[PDB]
């Protein structure tokens, strides 16, 4: 896994990517398969997660094949494995705080 | 006694193909209304005498989630909207600066016309006539047509409006009913009427006009959920079925949305999805006798666009009466799954991907081409 | 006839029929055919669309009838060649294929070999032409 | 040409000509052909009707050209078979028929036998195919 | 294909290509084809004009395919005859003609002889038919 370490109170950008640049559906889930963020059409949605008031995404980059998850105000409780689902492929990044 | 190669021409074999479809519609072209104006120079008159041929004993694999007819409808509708419901300010990213267009916002009449998609010469459309077709299995009753049924391009989220109903039962279709990352399309076999309005009696607030409501028959809505629940129960037999409000995100997803004229009606659907179902019967919709579930709606001027990333501003609301009368014909649901779902499943309104809205109507159709040249072994030999 | 299969170039039979049954049905229909035994704009528009489909099918038909001469099968609906079946392409017997399979199933059974077979057919025709011209001297 | 007889599929000659005369005229015209030596709605409507008639005649022509393969006569305007005339069908000589009768009169002379003859033609073709495949071994 | 030459009946190749090059290109394209690998009144008017052009080309094509039977070349794009070249009509060799000339140049080279050649082709076919029927006795 890619491993990214942040610190309590910081902001971390975790990313998923694609070879195709535009009109790509993606989702971010945690290790317990709970949705955090995702792309429906052109809209950003949130899942039933502990991160709904902290997680965000830079919508302008979605058409660049870059689908970031940004967690603002990190806590130790956020350390986890974050799973990207983009198109058909999956990616995993571990976040430590 | 040897097997020899034989070439045959006129072999009744077809393959999947992608071509550009044309369209037809019953446009009047003099009503000034956007769809009639667009259709005037986009679509032809419909076929005065359409025909359908049933193919006996033909099994065909259909897949509604890989259907390219969707992409064409998606692109035609985007053009229809961009050529009509023009925002005053259109702001989009460019990668990442912003590109801004300032232009007039005339108000226009805006009501959908069912559009029929038709195969060009050399192509044909196969239609799956099974009443239980789930969107990805084989279809054992297949007929050939040139044109699809007409589909009204209604653009909405959470609840699908107008379009069409299932023949017998509510059918729940999902590419993968268990991955928690697909929109579940629920097609109803009965419509539920929703009546939305702003009845010409509004004021303005400052320091309202942007206030409207929608009435949903209570009895039909609760009966509808009971039938949906019965099908969900079959899929998830040991779990509680919970209908909840949306999870968060852009307003177009969180609330319902639709467009009448230039009025975008963002409506709070919490009153429709706030209940826990035990087998197929529950409470949480008390029998008070009102028989009307009402939604609170707002008209917004700055909205997120569905056709791409960006925001757009539209001119303020019409001062008279706005009336919309729609048929809820299906739902777009997503699941709340996870490792800790200890005996329950939660369903929430979703949508926002306009392709899902179009798949819900185009799922029965496939475009094919004919490849008449085939080879089979024979017992004859060529004289040489 | 020509409407078999519910489409032009579906000439040899109904989709869903077995290959064998379709051939027999075609023969019977051929014998019968030779024995010989409300106005609106949309009518104009669709009349043109229908003609375009019919004209195109005819043009494609005629083109293919001449293109097939490359394998020595020009001007034919049913040809016959001198290329052996080679067994590995399909392990089924003549009766198994013709009696139980339809045409689509058959094409699925061997579509990993048709580009190979087409090449073999061309090679055989070239050799046949060469041999005939050598004999004519 | 193709307009002979004042209709499509009247190819072999003028109605009213004798069978013999029509054949000779056809040959002459064929040599010449190869040597090579105001706007109203009704124009749209009739343009479509005219095309439908022409497209249909072509489709029928092509269909029949392939159907006739059942007697070994595919792809032909004039065929030749190995079925004897059998005398009783018509007691006239070759010159009497070809020199004095037209085509309609001829068909009237023998229309009590054409279903019989068609059957005989099919049988001969089947036997010919069988014999050829038996020889090729 | 059929669009070669930028016109229907330009089937054998691009104008401007040499005769030889066109033949080779035709073979390659034939292999590929068999391997298989906004509304206004004027749309009605021109749709009809386009169909008339296409229908006419088909009718002419089919007619000529049958007319050529007079030389023993019916049903063919490329024929082969038994009439000697006779030298005087053209003093060029097979390679000189096919490698360096285009089709228009070639026709210009021999258009003082084509009526003569057409006559010779007819005569040969008549003799061939006569000989075959004499043998069949
Ligand atoms: C599902 O299908 C149904 C029907 O099959 C769709 O329902 C239709 O929705 C349209 C949208 O409003 C509605 O159209 C109105 O009908 C009224 C009947 O007379 C018209 O008067 C009204 O026209 C006025 O309002 C328009 C708003 O944009 C103006 O553009 C237009 O110029 C008119 O405006 C004048 O009058 C108003 C009056 O208050 C005034 O304020 C203005 O200033 C101006 O003076 C519309 O035509 C249809 O009647 C509905 N059909 C039915 C049967 O009710 C439904 O929308 C589909 N669902 C979805 C989601 O699309
Ligand atoms: C649930 O909501 C619906 C709205 O969709 C209510 O129906 C409406 O009830 C009002 C009651 O007055 C009806 O008004 C009547 O209109 C006619 C029109 O000519 C008028 O003549 C009558 O005097 C009266 O004003 C209204 O028409 C009716 N809407 C429809 C479409 O019929 C319904 O009553 C609500 N349910 C309950 C239990 O309140
Ligand atoms: C109005 C539209 C009508 C449709 C027109 C269709 C035109 C398409 C032409 C495709 C030609 C394919 O390519 C060519 O075909 C001819 C067909 O006899 C082959 O020709 C072969 O048969 C002929 C006659 O049996 C022989 O004289 C020749 O020696 C032999 O090789 C060529 O070897 C091949 O290179
Ligand atoms: C766009 C429309 C174009 C018109 C399409 C017309 C299609 C109509 C097809 C009719 C088929 C009639 O029925 C079938 O014909 C073929 C014609 O060769 C016959 O086939 C016969 O000739 C071929 C070639 O000479 C041999 O390979 C075969 O062994 C022999 O039996 C079949 O024995 C007969 O059963
Ligand atoms: C819908 C429109 C379709 C297009 C219709 C075109 C019809 C044009 C017909 C032109 C006929 C030309 O003239 C005639 O052609 C036939 C073609 O086999 C020749 O016939 C020759 O071939 C046939 C078959 O190979 C033999 O049976 C015959 O013994 C032999 O002479 C005639 O000797 C000639 O006189
Ligand atoms: C396959 O689907 C077709 C289309 O619905 C069914 O045929 C229809 O049956 C109804 C019964 O009243 C008729 O009114 C329609 O006109 C029929 N349509 C056509 C195109 O024929 C057909 O029965 C189905 N077959 C099976 C086995 O279910
Ligand atoms: C639609 O129904 C078909 C069956 O008719 C489902 O396909 C089956 O899925 C199971 C899952 O393990 C396989 O074992 C079967 O072999 C499949 N059958 C066939 C014929 O493919 C299909 O998945 C259903 N699709 C949806 C969208 O629910
Ligand atoms: C439908 O989604 C489920 C859930 O993602 C897929 O099943 C998973 O497949 C991965 C592959 O390694 C396994 O590790 C998971 O444990 C599986 N999950 C479960 C719950 O079994 C399933 O394969 C998908 N089905 C299709 C047809 O794609
Ligand atoms: C939508 O439903 C509401 C009730 O849920 C309707 O409002 C009621 O209308 C009746 C009719 O006389 C009044 O007596 C009630 O007092 C109203 N209720 C309230 C809370 O004011 C409303 O009119 C319906 N909408 C439409 C368009 O009819
Ligand atoms: C939305 O308005 C429609 C009419 O435009 C309502 O349908 C009518 O309901 C009354 C109630 O008794 C019936 O008598 C009428 O016959 C119905 N009309 C039609 C055409 O069926 C509809 O019920 C309204 N929706 C809601 C939720 O009240
Ligand atoms: C609808 O979803 C919300 C969001 O998850 C549920 O609210 C949560 O309920 C649990 C139960 O203990 C609380 O701990 C969470 O704090 C609640 N979330 C929030 C944001 O308050 C809600 O209960 C669901 N509704 C139904 C009917 O189950
Ligand atoms: C939809 O309406 C409901 C009211 O029925 C809103 O829920 C309320 O939100 C406020 C916000 O603080 C809470 O204090 C209330 O207790 C909530 N009410 C209930 C019954 O839970 C809901 O947020 C609205 N949703 C949207 C998307 O507008
Ligand atoms: C779910 O939303 C519905 C929307 O109707 C709520 O129903 C209303 O509940 C209040 C509670 O006092 C009643 O007074 C209303 O009359 C009810 N509406 C109708 C049309 O009868 C329902 O209670 C909500 N459920 C939960 C569990 O909160
Ligand atoms: C129905 O309620 C009973 C009460 O104990 C519970 O055990 C059961 O699981 C519930 N079933 C569903 C589907 O909610
Ligand atoms: C649906 O309405 C009927 C009407 O009697 C009621 O009994 C039933 O409990 C309702 N369903 C729910 C979920 O309240
Ligand atoms: C809702 O469905 C009924 C079923 O017949 C139909 O008559 C009605 O017009 C539909 N309403 C809309 C708005 O399309
Ligand atoms: C389909 O199966 C039935 C079973 O008797 C048969 O009669 C019918 O002809 C079949 N259709 C085709 C296309 O073979
Ligand atoms: C086809 O026959 C040849 C004959 O030697 C053989 O080598 C070849 O492998 C066969 N094709 C296949 C796919 O086995
Ligand atoms: C081919 O058919 C024979 C018949 O006995 C069988 O033994 C053989 O295994 C078959 N080959 C394959 C690949 O199934
Ligand atoms: C009709 O008879 C006259 C008599 O000379 C003849 O010249 C003419 O060609 C005949 N017409 C036909 C169709 O034979
Ligand atoms: C045809 O010739 C056969 C030869 O034996 C004969 O039996 C038959 O009766 C003849 N046909 C007629 C109508 O006489
Ligand atoms: C057939 O022609 C011959 C020729 O002499 C004649 O004698 C005989 O009677 C004719 N048959 C009939 C039935 O007229
Ligand atoms: C024209 O000449 C150029 C020179 O290279 C050649 O490539 C091209 O194919 C020629 N065009 C034709 C029609 O032969
Ligand atoms: C063609 O060959 C013959 C053979 O004798 C010859 O007489 C004739 O003159 C040749 N043609 C020309 C134009 O020389
Ligand atoms: C024909 O080609 C030969 C080749 O040597 C040449 O000698 C002769 O003069 C040529 N004839 C003419 C008329 O040019």
Numbering used by the authors:
A (entry chain C): 1 to 97
B (entry chain A): 32 to 126, 196 to 307, 325 to 359, 361 to 395, 397 to 405, 408 to 505
C (entry chain B), D (entry chain M), E (entry chain F): 512 to 548, 563 to 662
Please quote the authors directly.
HIV fusion is facilitated by the viral envelope glycoprotein (Env), a trimer of non-covalently linked heterodimers (gp120 and gp41) (Harrison, 2015; Lee et al., 2016). Binding of the receptor CD4 to gp120 triggers a series of conformational changes, including opening of the trimer, exposure of the co-receptor binding sites, and rearrangements of the gp41 helices (Blumenthal et al., 2012; Harrison, 2015; Ozorowski et al., 2017). The N-terminal region of gp41 forms the fusion peptide (FP), which becomes sequestered during the initial steps of receptor binding by moving toward the trimer interior (Ozorowski et al., 2017).
Reprocessing resulted in well-resolved C3-symmetric and asymmetric reconstructions that each exceeded the Fourier shell correlation (FSC) resolution estimate of the original map (C1: 3.6 Å, C3: 3.3 Å; EMD-8713 C3 map: 3.7 Å) and allowed for better interpretation of the FP/FPPR region. The FP can now be fully modeled into the new C3-symmetry map and is almost completely resolved in two out of three protomers of the asymmetric map. Intriguingly, both of the new maps contain additional resolved density for a long and narrow small molecule proximal to the FP in all protomers, although in the asymmetric reconstruction, this is less prominent in the protomer with a less-resolved FP. Because cryo-EM freezing techniques often include sub-critical micellar concentration (CMC) amounts of detergent to increase the number and tumbling of protein particles trapped over holes in vitreous ice, we hypothesized that the unassigned density could be the DDM (n-dodecyl-β-D-maltoside) used in our experiment. The refined coordinates of DDM were used to define a ligand binding pocket to conduct in silico virtual screening (VS) and identify other molecules that could potentially bind. The docking box was centered on the AutoSite volume in 1 of the pockets (at the interface between gp120 chain A and gp41 chains B and M) and then expanded to include the larger opening engaged by the maltose moieties (with orthogonal corners roughly located between A582 and Q658). Sometimes the binding of a gp120-gp41 interface antibody (PGT151) confers more stability to this region or the engineering of a more stable crystal lattice (Lai et al., 2019; Lee et al., 2016).
